[PDB]
Ligand binder design. Structure first.
Ligand SMILES: *C(=O)c1ccccc1OP(=O)(O)O
Length: 105
């Protein structure tokens, strides 16, 4: 049940997700999952990042869900549940700005 996950923030806006993530205390990979503002049936993974070029900044990735029942950011790497997707990206950075580390405070 996606709604029971502490990293699932539900229906909050993109601007709100940035307000929460742009905190100097958040290390790289601090994240949250929310509903997309514009895409019905898609979720959004918002992630904090930090580099000397840009300093602290936030990236947003669209998580698609198939009717067939699979979750993915890239169609080449699919998961049976959102929870499995989060667990996988907490170990592999792949194409993300950083691996997922901590749930947004
Ligand atoms: C995720 O839903 C998403 C992905 C990438 C950039 C922005 C974004 O958000 P909104 O879909 O809520 O605009």
């Amino acid at each position: 049940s996606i709604q029971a996950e502490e990293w699932y923030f539900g229906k909050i806006t993109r601007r709100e997700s940035e307000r929460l993530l742009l905190n100097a205390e958040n290390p790289r990979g601090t994240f949250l999952v929310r509903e997309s503002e514009t895409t019905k049936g898609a979720y959004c993974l918002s992630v904090s990042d930090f580099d000397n070029a840009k300093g602290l900044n936030v990236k947003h990735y669209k998580i698609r869900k198939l009717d067939s029942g699979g979750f993915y950011i890239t169609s080449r790497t699919q998961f049976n549940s959102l929870q499995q997707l989060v667990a996988y990206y907490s170990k592999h950075a792949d194409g993300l700005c950083h691996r997922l580390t901590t749930v947004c405070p």
